[PDB]
Symmetry: C2
Subunit: 284 residues, 2 copies
């Protein structure tokens, strides 16, 4: 089971319920969150994630998060996990609008074991299918009210999209816009390799900006790799030398099969795993 740490720094008893029945995180999915990886005694890219928490909170008209109190709760939760186990941990920051009719927002951090599915996805890779998201490429900017760039607690469709792919024998999904441009995964950001330069869809599309992807581009640029944001199509995916689904939890999952077509492997696949490994510890 998991560990809970409120921003007061108090660690919760394992069995005690925390949230009220009228908390807007549960009644309306009204809140924002972030996911952190605990590896080798510390959480990875803490500050980069707290900046996205601020950007998500700003988009959601939530009180601006108090970073000194969040940092302390992360440090306390981290020290409890690494004390209990040497395994990697899944750290989550939950930031809700609070109870209904009550102004105090709900905030706590939570660490849980890393699911075994990610260890296989890192190890073996994934098979993915392309799905039409339904949004055009101008969705994130021309329609700001749709808050597509925010990591909200309203993940029902993302989970349903994965359930749909599971029934099709696929391990993940790549969303594509109505006009045919690659968007993102339901829980990951798409990164491409070509000829050496690494490409990902631009962030002004109706997609999130990935903390892992940004840290990946920064180290890759420092090591001599040209990185750039371009509009990608499904054909560009198949003509590539590699496809990855990058995320804070699943560091780098290579897409070995896309829509039933097996994609060939490239020597670049082993170095890519090193880059994300080096990326998530760039803050250290």
């Amino acid at each position: 089971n998991a560990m809970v740490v409120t921003l007061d720094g108090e660690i919760l008893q394992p069995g005690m319920p925390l949230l009220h029945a009228d908390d807007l995180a549960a009644v309306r999915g009204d809140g924002v969150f972030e996911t952190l990886l605990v590896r080798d005694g510390r959480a990875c890219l803490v500050e980069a994630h707290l900046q996205r928490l601020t950007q998500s909170a700003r988009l959601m008209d939530l009180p601006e998060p108090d970073l000194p109190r969040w940092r302390r709760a992360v440090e306390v939760a981290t020290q409890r996990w690494v004390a209990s186990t040497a395994d990697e941990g899944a750290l989550r920051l939950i930031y809700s609008r609070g109870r209904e009719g009550g102004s105090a927002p709900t905030a706590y951090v939570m660490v849980s074991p890393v699911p075994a599915r990610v260890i296989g996805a890192r190890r073996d890779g994934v098979s993915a299918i392309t799905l039409d998201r339904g949004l055009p490429a101008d969705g994130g900017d021309a329609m700001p009210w749709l808050i597509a760039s925010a990591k909200t607690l309203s993940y029902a469709v993302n989970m349903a999209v994965l359930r749909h792919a599971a029934r099709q024998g696929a391990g993940d999904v790549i969303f594509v816009s109505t006009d045919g441009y690659v968007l993102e995964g339901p829980r990951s950001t798409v990164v491409i390799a070509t000829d050496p330069c690494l490409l990902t869809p631009p962030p002004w599309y109706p997609i999130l900006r990935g903390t892992t992807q940004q840290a990946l581009f920064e180290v890759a640029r420092a090591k001599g790799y040209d990185c750039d944001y371009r509009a990608l199509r499904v054909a560009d995916l198949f003509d590539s030398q590699g496809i990855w689904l990058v995320s804070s939890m699943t560091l780098a999952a290579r897409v070995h099969t896309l829509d039933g077509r097996r994609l060939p492997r490239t020597p670049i696949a082993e170095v890519f795993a090193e880059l994300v490994d080096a990326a998530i510890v760039s803050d250290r």
Copy 2:
């Protein structure tokens, strides 16, 4: 505010109920329904329990045990009716449960009807059209998007309303990418034209409104033609009346659309009466 779990416990409202890893708060993974408590009973209970079943099927949630839900609704209702003669906002919460645990989370909750609802029934709302971002063939050609389910993931619905609130608008009418009228973030859109009532078809990426369906049933019985049609923004303005229909805000007439003040029509008073009779057709 009263909470009644399906386990049969009538709980204190301020006592915490949910765990920190409950998927309703961690991922919004669940379904819900909202019912109005009026004159000693909840309105259109069976129609609401049927959509709860339909929402759970789209969400791969366990098939709801309706006898247990009926008891939780009847118990929660009668405790409200005992405390007050006021109308109540009763909602049923049905989540996938905790992480790594197979038991789904289920409970009923009653709260007072907000004052916003009392004004909207009396005076109506001003609404703006907004691009939903989905095309009109979105609900069918993209079944994975579960657009037809009343899910706990309303972050966009609430964010869309805050956006309209900052512009001085009281509600929103979603419009598809190709320009078809969809629904409201919390309501079903109904139009009047010449004595004819129209609503968007349910195969669009929209919910099926329990109130609108009951409205069509009563309206047809009293001689009014009702039908499902594809509407465009022009159809709204050439209409004789626009309403946002929902279980709590029974019928909110749109008095201002995209800044254009819309005049009142004799059908407007009849429209309010029909919805009143519809929500008690099961009685």
